[PDB]
Design an enzyme around this catalytic site. Structure first.
Site, short mmCIF file in Angstrom:
data_model
loop_
_atom_site.label_atom_id
_atom_site.label_comp_id
_atom_site.label_asym_id
_atom_site.label_seq_id
_atom_site.Cartn_x
_atom_site.Cartn_y
_atom_site.Cartn_z
N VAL A 12 0.96 -1.08 -0.27
CA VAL A 12 0.23 -0.07 -0.48
C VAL A 12 0.55 0.93 0.33
O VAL A 12 0.53 2.62 -0.76
CB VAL A 12 -0.97 -0.17 1.40
CG1 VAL A 12 -1.93 -0.89 0.90
CG2 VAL A 12 -0.42 0.44 2.49
N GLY A 13 2.35 1.27 0.83
CA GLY A 13 2.70 2.63 1.09
C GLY A 13 3.54 2.55 2.08
O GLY A 13 4.01 1.04 1.87
N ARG A 14 4.97 3.32 1.81
CA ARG A 14 6.04 3.22 2.52
C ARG A 14 6.15 4.31 3.65
O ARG A 14 5.29 5.09 3.78
CB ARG A 14 7.24 3.49 1.57
CG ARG A 14 6.93 2.84 0.13
CD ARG A 14 8.24 2.19 0.10
NE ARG A 14 8.77 1.37 -1.24
CZ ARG A 14 8.81 -0.44 -1.38
NH1 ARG A 14 9.53 -0.86 -0.13
NH2 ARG A 14 8.56 -0.77 -2.37
N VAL A 15 5.14 -1.41 5.07
CA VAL A 15 3.59 -1.57 5.13
C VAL A 15 3.05 -2.35 4.04
O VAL A 15 2.66 -0.89 2.97
CB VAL A 15 3.38 -0.03 5.65
CG1 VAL A 15 2.02 -0.49 6.29
CG2 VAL A 15 4.33 0.42 5.98
N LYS A 20 2.72 -3.69 8.87
CA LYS A 20 4.38 -3.00 8.34
C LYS A 20 4.99 -3.97 8.50
O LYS A 20 5.04 -5.17 8.60
CB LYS A 20 4.05 -2.28 10.08
CG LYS A 20 5.19 -1.18 10.77
CD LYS A 20 4.45 0.33 10.55
CE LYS A 20 5.06 0.57 11.20
NZ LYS A 20 4.63 1.88 11.37
N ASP A 108 3.71 14.55 16.59
CA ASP A 108 3.94 14.75 14.76
C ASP A 108 2.94 14.49 13.89
O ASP A 108 2.11 13.11 13.29
CB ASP A 108 4.78 13.88 13.82
CG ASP A 108 4.45 13.81 12.59
OD1 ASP A 108 4.76 15.33 11.91
OD2 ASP A 108 5.28 12.79 11.52
C1 LIG Z 1 -1.00 5.32 10.57
C2 LIG Z 1 0.06 6.45 9.65
C3 LIG Z 1 -0.14 5.81 8.18
O1 LIG Z 1 -1.74 6.58 7.52
N1 LIG Z 1 1.12 5.12 7.45
C4 LIG Z 1 0.31 4.69 6.06
C5 LIG Z 1 0.83 5.34 5.00
C6 LIG Z 1 0.73 4.68 3.97
C7 LIG Z 1 0.30 3.97 3.26
C8 LIG Z 1 -0.17 2.52 4.51
C9 LIG Z 1 -0.26 3.22 5.95
O2 LIG Z 1 -0.22 2.71 7.21
C10 LIG Z 1 -1.80 2.08 6.79
N2 LIG Z 1 -2.67 2.33 5.34
C11 LIG Z 1 -4.31 1.83 6.00
N3 LIG Z 1 -5.34 2.40 4.95
C12 LIG Z 1 -3.79 2.52 3.29
C13 LIG Z 1 -5.14 2.12 3.04
N4 LIG Z 1 -4.04 2.51 1.17
N5 LIG Z 1 -3.61 3.79 1.86
C14 LIG Z 1 -2.18 4.31 0.96
C15 LIG Z 1 -3.76 3.75 3.32
N6 LIG Z 1 -4.64 1.43 7.29
C16 LIG Z 1 -4.05 1.06 8.58
C17 LIG Z 1 -2.70 1.60 8.27
CL1 LIG Z 1 -1.36 1.52 9.71
#
Ligand SMILES: */C=C/C(=O)Nc1ccccc1Oc1nc(Nc2cnn(C)c2)ncc1Cl
Length: 269
Positions: A12-14, A15, A20, A108
């Site tokens: 999804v992202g930078r 997890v 994580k 933050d």
């Molecule tokens: C809680 C900080 C955070 O948002 N960390 C983060 C950053 C980018 C991508 C994921 C992510 O961690 C989480 N994402 C999501 N849902 C989600 C769906 N698409 N993206 C980009 C995020 N849900 C929970 C977490 Cl911990």
């Protein structure tokens, strides 16, 4: 306590997709973060369920930042949602401040760390940032919980206007820090209710002692929701987006306060 535990899905992202991951250098920063996460338990904070790794709840909505400013199509939202988001945020932060033995500071606070679930209605805290950072922090002073109040103030201005704070300045981080340190704040909002305007400006005062506590913010925001019904409605309607640059140090709000002044007139007149 701490629960022990999966099918790994796309990243999804930078997890990836609730997980994580460690990069074995972060194994120490990992221990400091996990010890505090097990002690925390609150509705408006992310729910934690070999090798070393976590299992959070997957918020399908993503970050508040992605909802406000992310990839189109963006969803529609009302003044109720904006106020509800900020209320639930201050509720979670107040839980961290009201923590024994020592008060845990988030440090933050920003929309990129605020997740949304249940159709974008429930907000949850999840433990570059110069726009939301209090002046005493990046100058190198003994900061305290009142730095989260500054961040909340900026977030309040951000959901009402749906503008990236200090996007007009831009540039590297030190250019925003220089501005905030000299006293520059986001521009005032057209036709903003005086109660909301007063809480916002107090929250981002230069002197940290003049900012309200999170307990005070929660209580004030809770009493204001009386005049902001409809926060339970899920986000589902599209939004074709055009923003007008605000000349003369004043910007239009995205949300509409018509219903607020209406309900306010009924009680006061
Ligand atoms: C809680 C900080 C955070 O948002 N960390 C983060 C950053 C980018 C991508 C994921 C992510 O961690 C989480 N994402 C999501 N849902 C989600 C769906 N698409 N993206 C980009 C995020 N849900 C929970 C977490 Cl911990």
């Amino acid at each position: 306590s701490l629960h022990m535990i999966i099918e790994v899905e796309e990243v999804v992202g930078r997890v990836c997709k609730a997980i994580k991951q460690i990069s074995e250098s972060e194994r120490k920063a990992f221990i400091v973060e996990l010890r505090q996460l097990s002690r925390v338990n609150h509705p408006n904070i992310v729910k934690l369920y070999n090798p070393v790794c976590l299992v959070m709840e997957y918020a399908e909505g993503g970050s508040l930042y992605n909802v406000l400013h992310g990839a189109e199509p963006l969803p529609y939202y009302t003044a109720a949602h904006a106020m509800s988001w900020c209320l639930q945020c201050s509720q979670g932060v107040a839980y961290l401040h009201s923590m024994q033995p020592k008060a845990l500071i988030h440090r933050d606070l920003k929309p990129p760390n605020l997740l949304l679930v249940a159709g974008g209605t429930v907000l949850k805290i999840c433990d570059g940032s110069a726009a939301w950072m209090a002046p005493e922090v990046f100058e190198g002073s003994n900061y305290s919980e009142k730095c989260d109040v500054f961040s909340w103030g900026i977030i309040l201005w951000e959901v009402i206007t749906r503008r990236k704070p200090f996007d007009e300045i831009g540039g590297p981080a030190f250019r925003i820090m220089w501005a905030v340190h000299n006293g520059t704040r986001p521009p005032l909002i057209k036709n903003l209710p005086k109660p909301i305007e007063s809480l916002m400006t107090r929250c981002w005062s230069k002197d940290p002692s003049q900012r309200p506590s999170m307990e005070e913010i929660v209580k004030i925001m809770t009493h204001l929701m009386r005049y902001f019904p409809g926060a339970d409605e899920p986000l589902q309607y599209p939004c074709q987006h055009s923003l007008p640059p605000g000349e003369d140090g004043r910007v239009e709000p995205y949300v509409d306060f018509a219903e607020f002044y209406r309900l306010w007139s009924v009680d006061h007149g």
